[PDB]
Design a protein around this nucleic acid. Structure first.
Ligand code: FE
Length: 202
DNA sequence: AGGTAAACGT
DNA sequence: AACGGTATTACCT
């Protein structure tokens, strides 16, 4: 019944911290606005994204990249809010990763219908560090697979405040998000947000 | 030699 | 609509 080797779900872990997290998402986005990024192959992603911390994930003509600069504003990504950093540290510790030091937080916003096709997180050079993923707002179905794309999927509803952590043996597992169902949430109104914490540099 | 990118039909 | 083809290649370093 645990998610996977090295992976855990902490249901409602961030529920108490959620209102402050959402205030800080709005602050981050007031500086580096949400944008829907374009893949190298030229398709616009359905998820809108921004980043905070020292490195932000971005698409480019040439591929994917972690960059210290927001290519839309040409300014550094906003500093990682202390509320984000503290929640991440607490969740990582609860999940068995007490030494995790993230330097990058990708903020995803899902409107109805928005999805993330099954992929691997592998843009980070240090594979030893876990990924911490915080869900806020509307619920979504998270796919969590194996090392091969065709490995059987677990499908888990992620609700407001749920935190998922993966690392170690499951660090490179395929995962994704199924198209978001429309709904109402009193804190986010009509969307889902996700915070994904990584150590993207040295 | 390796790593990268991937988001339509059944 | 869950599953899997496609990158079975074309480019970089
Ligand atoms: Fe991911």
């Amino acid at each position: 019944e645990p998610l996977a080797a090295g992976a855990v779900i902490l249901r409602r872990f961030a529920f108490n911290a959620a209102e402050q997290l959402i205030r800080d998402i709005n602050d981050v986005a007031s500086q580096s606005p949400f944008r829907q990024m374009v893949t190298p192959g030229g398709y616009t992603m359905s998820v809108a994204m921004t980043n905070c911390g020292h490195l932000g994930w971005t698409t480019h003509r040439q591929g994917y990249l972690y960059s210290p600069i927001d290519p839309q504003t040409n300014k550094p990504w906003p500093a990682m809010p202390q509320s984000f950093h503290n929640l991440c540290q607490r969740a990582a510790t609860a999940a068995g990763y007490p030494d995790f030091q993230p330097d990058a937080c990708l903020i995803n916003r899902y409107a109805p219908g928005a999805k993330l096709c099954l992929h691997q997180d592998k843009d980070e050079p240090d594979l030893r560090a876990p990924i911490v993923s915080v869900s806020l707002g509307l619920p979504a179905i998270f796919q969590f697979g194996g090392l091969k794309r065709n490995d059987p999927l677990k499908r888990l509803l992620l609700e407001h405040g749920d935190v998922v952590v993966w690392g170690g043996e499951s660090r490179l597992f395929y995962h994704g998000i199924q198209p978001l169902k429309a709904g109402f949430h009193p804190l986010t109104i009509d969307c889902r947000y996700n915070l994904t914490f990584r150590q993207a540099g040295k």
